[PDB]
Amino acid sequence: DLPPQLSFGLYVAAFALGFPLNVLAIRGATAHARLRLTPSAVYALNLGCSDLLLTVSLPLKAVEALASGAWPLPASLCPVFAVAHFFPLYAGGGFLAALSAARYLGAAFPLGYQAFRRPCYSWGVCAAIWALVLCHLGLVFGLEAPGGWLDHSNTSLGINTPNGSPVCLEAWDPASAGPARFSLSLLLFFLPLAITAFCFVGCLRALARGSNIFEMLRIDEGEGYYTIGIGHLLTKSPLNAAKSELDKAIGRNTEAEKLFNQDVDAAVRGILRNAKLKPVYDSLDAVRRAALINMVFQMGETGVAGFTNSLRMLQQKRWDEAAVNLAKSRWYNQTPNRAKRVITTFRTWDAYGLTHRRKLRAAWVAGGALLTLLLCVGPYNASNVASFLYPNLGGSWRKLGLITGAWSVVLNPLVTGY
Ligand SMILES: C[C@H](C(=O)O)[C@H](c1ccc2c(c1)O[C@@H](C1CCN([C@@H](C)c3cc(F)ccc3OC(F)(F)F)CC1)CC2)C1CC1
Ligand SMILES: Cc1cc(OCCCS(C)(=O)=O)cc(C)c1-c1cccc(COc2cc3c(cn2)[C@H]2[C@@H](C3)[C@@H]2C(=O)O)c1
């Protein structure tokens, strides 16, 4: 049991909210792809376009719920309501799976994806999304649905006539309506749901994997012997011999954090070894200790002990006087864009950006994308299972199911726009 006073009230309250925010969502992705041509902007704009398709179909579904299931527009427009309503209920999953995928790929693998990704590639995914759902629905509609080349009946296209008024699709024969709705859910929903979830997982795991000083030395650097990783020197002799030296160190054939961490873990043992630096490190900031390891990697324990006047000014807890003595040095003149970033960081992470926030925002797009699929689309998609397995259950479940599914239009743009 579901009263029409409530069903109409839910379908119009979701339309009054869905329509403008989607207009804000579309405008947002158009403005941000003009300024940069972002890969997930295509997903956000394409999600908005499909979302609004459902939004303008809500009044007709509100009037349908009013006329109590009965179809109130002519029979020649029901295959156009079906395509406008049920396409975004399945489509949304494919976009939020690629949108959340784009967010994860640039969270876990930022230097690889940035080089890989381009706009046209992302249009390719949506182009395959539009086609897939339009064909899966199209074929299931052109065959199984009442009024196709399978049902030899006088009843119009997608129209069922019970004594009463003609109803569009909802009055479908339970024996055939079940299996046709189950294949749509099984294929077009559980698989895009898995990627979104696995991406949200990966985004959480990209948060715990970062290291403040790595990002500080990634910006700083990036014999002249050919090697791999963030300064993790391979060998002095040339390449098949250098290859397995990297392969046996990680396990995988032919990540740089584990090799930087091990490199730094031993680099601290070198600072302790050099007695002229050891007291200074032990009295310094956790923040300022990383500004010293920056110079240690750059010059060595020789050059670090050489600047004795400035290091003593660091032991004496005087940052401003040491930074001036450091501003007039052979190192400052040698490396001009790196020196100053260490000097300002010694005196005061502010001087260094940029990765925490992007790994955090991307963990929140795929995080919200997971819950909009489990709170909007989800309950609906779960009824195409429960009604399929247990045929005794009434339309009261699916009516609320198609109601939560319709509240996708309000929830989905909030995910992308936060
Ligand atoms: C991030 C990359 C970029 O942007 O540049 C992009 C990429 C990489 C991985 C994934 C990327 C997209 O989309 C995810 C999608 C792909 C489209 N699938 C659809 C088409 C789908 C497949 C099914 F088997 C069943 C239902 C489906 O749902 C539907 F509703 F859309 F139909 C949803 C997952 C999976 C992971 C690369 C250019 C290719
Ligand atoms: C196949 C077809 C034929 C057609 O016209 C045939 C020519 C008309 S005539 C014979 O009068 O000349 C018009 C359209 C829009 C379509 C068409 C194309 C793409 C998608 C669709 C919409 O399909 C669907 C499919 C399902 C639903 C809704 N719409 C309900 C079921 C399964 C899903 C669900 O409840 O989960 C329909």
Side-chain angles (χ1 to χ4, degrees), residues 319-320 322-324 326-327 329 331-333 335-339 341-346:
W319 319 133
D320 53 3
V324 171
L326 279 151
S329 60
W331 159 53
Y332 190 94
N333 198 50
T335 47
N337 277 260
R338 185 173 167 162
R341 282 204 257 92
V342 178
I343 297 320
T344 56
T345 300
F346 253 121

Side-chain angles (χ1 to χ4, degrees), residues 270-272 274-275 277-284 292 295-296 300 302-303 305-306:
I271 292 154
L272 299 162
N274 286 248
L277 298 155
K278 205 245 185 174
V280 191
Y281 170 87
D282 285 282
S283 295
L284 270 179
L292 194 69
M295 295 165 75
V296 171
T302 55

Side-chain angles (χ1 to χ4, degrees), residues 39 42-43 46 95 98 118-131:
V42 196
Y43 296 144
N46 278 301
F95 303 97
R118 292 178 179 83
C120 49
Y121 292 2
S122 284
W123 278 112
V125 184
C126 325
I129 290 158
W130 279 90

Side-chain angles (χ1 to χ4, degrees), residues 72-151 153-164 166-171 173-208 210-215 217-219 222 224 227 229 231 235 237-244 246-247 249-251 253-254 256-257 260-261 263-264 266-268 270-272 274-275 277-287 290-296 298-300 302-303 305-306 310 314 319-320 322-324 326-327 329 331-333 335-339 341-346:
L73 283 102
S76 63
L77 268 79
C78 158
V80 175
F81 167 78
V83 75
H85 202 105
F86 291 102
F87 172 94
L89 285 166
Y90 289 114
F95 303 97
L96 289 164
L99 171 86
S100 68
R103 284 289 166 178
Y104 157 77
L105 275 66
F109 322 98
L111 295 174
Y113 182 60
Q114 193 184 265
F116 174 43
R117 73 142 95 144
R118 292 178 179 83
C120 49
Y121 292 2
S122 284
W123 278 112
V125 184
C126 325
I129 290 158
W130 279 90
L132 173 56
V133 186
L134 278 164
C135 291
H136 204 335
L137 297 188
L139 266 69
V140 167
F141 186 80
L143 270 83
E144 199 55 83
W149 219 265
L150 201 86
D151 193 359
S153 55
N154 210 271
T155 59
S156 194
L157 275 89
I159 300 287
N160 284 298
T161 57
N163 214 202
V167 173
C168 158
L169 268 165
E170 292 290 293
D173 182 24
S176 69
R181 276 162 166 156
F182 186 87
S183 76
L184 287 186
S185 195
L186 193 63
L187 251 55
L188 306 162
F189 172 77
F190 299 104
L191 193 38
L193 177 63
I195 306 119
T196 323
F198 157 74
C199 292
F200 160 68
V201 169
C203 285
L204 300 165
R205 288 174 179 179
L207 294 158
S211 173
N212 261 315
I213 194 192
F214 177 80
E215 322 298 328
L217 280 201
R218 164 184 61 89
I219 296 165
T227 185
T235 59
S237 54
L239 281 206
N240 289 99
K243 270 201 171 287
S244 203
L246 189 140
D247 299 334
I250 58 153
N253 309 312
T254 55
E257 200 263 339
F260 170 86
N261 215 327
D263 183 88
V264 163
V268 177
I271 292 154
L272 299 162
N274 286 248
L277 298 155
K278 205 245 185 174
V280 191
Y281 170 87
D282 285 282
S283 295
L284 270 179
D285 291 345
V287 182
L292 194 69
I293 300 154
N294 189 310
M295 295 165 75
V296 171
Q298 200 184 343
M299 318 279 288
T302 55
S310 307
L314 298 168
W319 319 133
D320 53 3
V324 171
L326 279 151
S329 60
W331 159 53
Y332 190 94
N333 198 50
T335 47
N337 277 260
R338 185 173 167 162
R341 282 204 257 92
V342 178
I343 297 320
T344 56
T345 300
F346 253 121

